[PDB]
Amino acid sequence: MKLLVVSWGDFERWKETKYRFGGETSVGPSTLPILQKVIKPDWTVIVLSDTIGKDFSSVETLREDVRNRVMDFLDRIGAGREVDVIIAPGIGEFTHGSFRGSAMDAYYYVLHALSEIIPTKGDLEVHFDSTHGLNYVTLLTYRALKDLLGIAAVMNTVTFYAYNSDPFVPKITKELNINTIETTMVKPTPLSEPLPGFDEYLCPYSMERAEFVRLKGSLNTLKNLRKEKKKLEAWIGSLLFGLPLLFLEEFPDIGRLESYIEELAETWGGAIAVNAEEKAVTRRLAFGSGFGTLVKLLFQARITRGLLVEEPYSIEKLYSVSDRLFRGSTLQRVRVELGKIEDKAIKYARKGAFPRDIPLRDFLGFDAANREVSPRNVLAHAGLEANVVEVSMEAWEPKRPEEEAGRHTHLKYTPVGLKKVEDIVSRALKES
Amino acid sequence: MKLLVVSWGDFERWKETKYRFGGETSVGPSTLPILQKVIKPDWTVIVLSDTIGKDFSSVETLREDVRNRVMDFLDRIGAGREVDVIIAPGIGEFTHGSFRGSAMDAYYYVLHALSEIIPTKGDLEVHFDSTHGLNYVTLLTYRALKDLLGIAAVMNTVTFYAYNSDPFVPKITKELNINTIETTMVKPTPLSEPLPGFDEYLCPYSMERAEFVRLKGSLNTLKNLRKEKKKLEAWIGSLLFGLPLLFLEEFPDIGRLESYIEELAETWGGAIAVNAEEKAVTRRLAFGSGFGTLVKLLFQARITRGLLVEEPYSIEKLYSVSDRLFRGSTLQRVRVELGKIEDKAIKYARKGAFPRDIPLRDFLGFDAANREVSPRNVLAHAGLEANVVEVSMEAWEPKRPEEEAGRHTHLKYTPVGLKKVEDIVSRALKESH
Numbered sequence: 030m031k032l033l034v035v036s037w038g039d040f041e042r043w044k045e046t047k048y049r050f051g052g053e054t055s056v057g058p059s060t061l062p063i064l065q066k067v068i069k070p071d072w073t074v075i076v077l078s079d080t081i082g083k084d085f086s087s088v089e090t091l092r093e094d095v096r097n098r099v100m101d102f103l104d105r106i107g108a109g110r111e112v113d114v115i116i117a118p119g120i121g122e123f124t125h126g127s128f129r130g131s132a133m134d135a136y137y138y139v140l141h142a143l144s145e146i147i148p149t150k151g152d153l154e155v156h157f158d159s160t161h162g163l164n165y166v167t168l169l170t171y172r173a174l175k176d177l178l179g180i181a182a183v184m185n186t187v188t189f190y191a192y193n194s195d196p197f198v199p200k201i202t203k204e205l206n207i208n209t210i211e212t213t214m215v216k217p218t219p220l221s222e223p224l225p226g227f228d229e230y231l232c233p234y235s236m237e238r239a240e241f242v243r244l245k246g247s248l249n250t251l252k253n254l255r256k257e258k259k260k261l262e263a264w265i266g267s268l269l270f271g272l273p274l275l276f277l278e279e280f281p282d283i284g285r286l287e288s289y290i291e292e293l294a295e296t297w298g299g300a301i302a303v304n305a306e307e308k309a310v311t312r313r314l315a316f317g318s319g320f321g322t323l324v325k326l327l328f329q330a331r332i333t334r335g336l337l338v339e340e341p342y343s344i345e346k347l348y349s350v351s352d353r354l355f356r357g358s359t360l361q362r363v364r365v366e367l368g369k370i371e372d373k374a375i376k377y378a379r380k381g382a383f384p385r386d387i388p389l390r391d392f393l394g395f396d397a398a399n400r401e402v403s404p405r406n407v408l409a410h411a412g413l414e415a416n417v418v419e420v421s422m423e424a425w426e427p428k429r430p431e432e433e434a435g436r437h438t439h440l441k442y443t444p445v446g447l448k449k450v451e452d453i454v455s456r457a458l459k460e461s
Numbered sequence: 462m463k464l465l466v467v468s469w470g471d472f473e474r475w476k477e478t479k480y481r482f483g484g485e486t487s488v489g490p491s492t493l494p495i496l497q498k499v500i501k502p503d504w505t506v507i508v509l510s511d512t513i514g515k516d517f518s519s520v521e522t523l524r525e526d527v528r529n530r531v532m533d534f535l536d537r538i539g540a541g542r543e544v545d546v547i548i549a550p551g552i553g554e555f556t557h558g559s560f561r562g563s564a565m566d567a568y569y570y571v572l573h574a575l576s577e578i579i580p581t582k583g584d585l586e587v588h589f590d591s592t593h594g595l596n597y598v599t600l601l602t603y604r605a606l607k608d609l610l611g612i613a614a615v616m617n618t619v620t621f622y623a624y625n626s627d628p629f630v631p632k633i634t635k636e637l638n639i640n641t642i643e644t645t646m647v648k649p650t651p652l653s654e655p656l657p658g659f660d661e662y663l664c665p666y667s668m669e670r671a672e673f674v675r676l677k678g679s680l681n682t683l684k685n686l687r688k689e690k691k692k693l694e695a696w697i698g699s700l701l702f703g704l705p706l707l708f709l710e711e712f713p714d715i716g717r718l719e720s721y722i723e724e725l726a727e728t729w730g731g732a733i734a735v736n737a738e739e740k741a742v743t744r745r746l747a748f749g750s751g752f753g754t755l756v757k758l759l760f761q762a763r764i765t766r767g768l769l770v771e772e773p774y775s776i777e778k779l780y781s782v783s784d785r786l787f788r789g790s791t792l793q794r795v796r797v798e799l800g801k802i803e804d805k806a807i808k809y810a811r812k813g814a815f816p817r818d819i820p821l822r823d824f825l826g827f828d829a830a831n832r833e834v835s836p837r838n839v840l841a842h843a844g845l846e847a848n849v850v851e852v853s854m855e856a857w858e859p860k861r862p863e864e865e866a867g868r869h870t871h872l873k874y875t876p877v878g879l880k881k882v883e884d885i886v887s888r889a890l891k892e893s894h
């Protein structure tokens with residue numbers, strides 16, 4: 030899939046010029062038509078500041094005024110139907126309006142918007158144009174794109190191209206080349222940050238601190254996160270540290286995460302005060318790092334949801350998950366650890382033995398007086414620590430036990446074991 | 462170390478205004494004075510485009526023009542003279558003159574310049590100001606900064622802060638706030654790129670095929686790198702995959718890396734054609750990704766050179782190197798693998814036995830079943846694979862062998878073994894890319 034993303038300011042102020050790109054030429058006020066003609070994207074995203082808004086009735090008449098004039102402009106130079114328009118929250122004191130709030134809301138808002146548009150299946154070829162952007166909006170859009178594509182690159186091949194045309198200079202320009210300023214194959218970067226303290230999801234920008242403590246207390250999201258924060262951190266660590274059984278057992282509820290993000294999003298939006306006479310927008314809540322982490326966490330869950338196999342969790346199924354999820358020395362460590370359990374299962378199968386509901390330590394034949402569950406042993410053994418895992422072999426009539434044993438040998442954490450592993454992985458994620 | 466980096470365009474066109482930052486207030490045409498007062502950096506770096514220069518009699522006069530104009534502007538505003546000015550190669554056809562070449566040259570140039578500025582010892586607090594920047598030079602500067610800080614973060618704590626001012630509207634603007642638009646604890650990110658083909662170090666932008674072929678053919682770098690490539694990729698893979706013995710055995714020659722980067726940088730600068738009459742700069746060579754990889758590779762070697770020691774490698778030394786280079790599950794696996802060899806040495810010591818020049822497979826007691834060296838066993842066992850490593854125990858009189866064995870037990874790759882590990886690690890680095 031080919032995706033095109035452009036950063037736009039006040040598109041109406043741009044002058045007609047001609048652009049050169051990929052053995053093609055084009056005349057008009059923006060690069061988008063020639064970019065679309067050479068690149069041939071399957072989808073186009075335009076990121077705009079809402080600070081080009083003029084009619085201050087309230088929030089919906091602002092996003093409307095901007096979307097009207099943008100859709101006007103896309104018709105004017107024929108940018109086609111396959112378009113999404115992200116109206117990001119800008120800030121500043123302009124000729125027709127005043128916009129106050131955290132600068133960083135534009136990052137979290139664009140991050141959130143892109144997380145709903147970027148395909149979570151198949152390979153991604155991403156094309157980014159920085160020609161026309163506000164400095165800060167273009168930079169936060171670039172960062173938001175790279176953060177999400179890094180997560181996408183966990184499961185899929187991801188290539189990223191950035192463009193910037195020659196500088197338009199009004200009195201001397203004849204034509205502007207579209208220069209490739211970046212070409213990069215995107216490195217797989219799993220989410221590597223804990224969920225923060227319940228202060229850093231929504232933050233008061235210009236809200237009295239007594240009013241904040243009130244609304245924070247009313248958010249069901251923060252109370253639900255209280256329970257699940259450690260379980261969600263355990264899942265993040267599963268991808269980062271190569272713990273395939275924990276990846277399955279802690280796989281997050283995509284529906285629940287959607288609902289957490291939506292409530293934080295509509296709470297932020299609801300705290301935007303518009304003064305039609307003063308022509309002033311004040312975003313009294315700011316998004317915190319915690320909103321970003323939830324958006325990245327939901328995106329990673331969507332990217333990897335295909336790997337959530339039906340129970341029970343056989344060695345064969347854990348190999349299949351591991352082979353998709355892990356790379357380099359992490360994959361090879363995980364395969365060696367599963368192989369040790371598999372070789373034991375084969376030995377058992379050959380003797381017509383099928384242990385059910387047996388601690389992994391008893392399955393492998395361990396000596397007594399080492400029942401302490403250490404970070405070292407959880408992290409060094411792909412989370413398959415001998416004191417926290419229960420093995421079951423579903424009895425069968427073996428013909429080729431070396432082929433069969435992997436399918437009939439199932440692993441899970443004991444209820445006590447899972448809590449110990451959660452504490453260890455959560456802690457290891459925080460120390461980082 | 463507190464480092465302030467600012468991305469600037471045409472500083473002479475900026476209007477006087479007022480800035481708010483960290484409770485302080487400032488009148489003037491630039492953020493820089495108030496940024497310095499509040500942040501109190503140990504050093505300031507200014508990144509701006511060549512395309513400000515108005516003197517085409519030489520390439521070096523063009524740079525001294527831009528430098529002198531910046532120096533004068535710093536006196537005009539309250540700003541300190543403790544600064545590095547990176548005059549990046551910009552592109553565009555302007556009234557005062559013309560500049561042609563690869564747009565991406567600015568990235569490779571700034572990356573190279575920053576690699577020689579950013580300290581390679583101690584923690585780093587980096588502050589980046591994009592308020593005054595061109596978009597493309599800001600993006601390429603931001604990228605180069607993050608690429609190097611990611612490598613620095615392997616050995617040291619690195620914090621990154623980014624700033625941008627409220628937008629400037631000509632007569633409406635009274636006071637522009639300077640906004641923090643990023644606060645990042647930089648993740649350790651070792652080089653994970655192989656060295657590319659010999660097409661991708663220097664490329665012709667505007668140069669006859671034969672003259673390029675002559676320049677390419679003159680480069681000592683490309684000849685040497687042909688033979689050295691695999692050993693350098695083995696070293697890159699040692700940091701990425703958690704192979705502490707290979708890190709020590711393949712530690713690159715910093716002097717030779719410096720020689721390669723300087724030669725490529727001198728050839729690039731020597732190919733800049735400055736036509737004095739018609740006010741044109743043409744950069745006839747373009748940097749390739751290979752130049753970037755070498756700059757990142759030398760920066761990583763400088764960052765980690767403190768861990769290198771002389772040839773006998775003890776298990777104790779491998780533990781301390783590992784505790785500095787590696788984290789998470791990679792670190793815990795390396796410690797378990799070293800521990801297995803240590804526990805065996807402790808058993809040997811308690812028996813009063815001190816094997817020398819013994820294959821690790823013989824030291825550990827292995828079945829004659831598998832002598833083949835697999836990617837699986839090299840990468841899963843921290844590169845301490847039983848068929849490629851040799852152990853030597855230095856005879857001593859044990860009293861507490863559990864605490865003593867690690868210092869007296871040494872590991873080496875066999876000459877054959879090392880070449881097998883180099884192949885697997887090089888291939889694994891290329892395959893992971």
Ligand SMILES: Nc1ncnc2c1ncn2[C@@H]1O[C@H](CO)[C@@H](OP(=O)(O)OC[C@@H]2O[C@H](n3cnc4c(N)ncnc43)[C@H]3OP(=O)(O)O[C@H]32)[C@H]1O
Pocket residue numbers: 042043044045046057058059160161162194195196197198469470471472474475510512513555593594595596597
């Ligand atoms: N069809 C179009 N119509 C109108 N604008 C277009 C169009 N196509 C592309 N653009 C670009 O889109 C941004 C619209 O504002 C501009 O991009 P950017 O070049 O990044 O503008 C930034 C300013 O260029 C200025 N500076 C003018 N001289 C030079 C110069 N010779 N060396 C480096 N910078 C220069 C800088 O001074 P500072 O730092 O105050 O602000 C920058 C335009 O060049």
Ligand SMILES: Nc1ncnc2c1ncn2[C@@H]1O[C@H](CO)[C@@H](OP(=O)(O)OC[C@@H]2O[C@H](n3cnc4c(N)ncnc43)[C@H]3OP(=O)(O)O[C@H]32)[C@H]1O
Pocket residue numbers: 037038039040042043078080081119123161162163164165474475476477478489490491592593594626627628629630637
């Ligand atoms: N002391 C200073 N003197 C002169 N400039 C200063 C100073 N301090 C900071 N700056 C900033 O430096 C850049 C160049 O002057 C400016 O920021 P940049 O992000 O480069 O803004 C460029 C243009 O602002 C325009 N646009 C003005 N309204 C709005 C608006 N309300 N919605 C979105 N964009 C707006 C954009 O339209 P477009 O795409 O044609 O080009 C941009 C200035 O805000």
Ligand SMILES: Nc1ncnc2c1ncn2[C@@H]1O[C@H](CO)[C@H]2OP(=O)(O)O[C@H]21
Pocket residue numbers: 366367369370389393406410413414415416
């Ligand atoms: N606490 C522990 N100490 C030593 N080895 C362990 C421990 N927990 C798990 N393992 C080893 O991890 C592998 C996957 O379960 C398995 O292979 P093993 O070496 O037979 O013992 C296990």
Ligand SMILES: Nc1ncnc2c1ncn2[C@@H]1O[C@H](CO)[C@H]2OP(=O)(O)O[C@H]21
Pocket residue numbers: 798799801802821825831838842845846847848
């Ligand atoms: N080819 C191999 N097959 C199985 N285990 C290996 C191999 N090569 C090395 N190891 C194991 O890696 C550890 C550090 O050298 C050491 O602990 P072990 O389990 O005694 O066997 C070694």
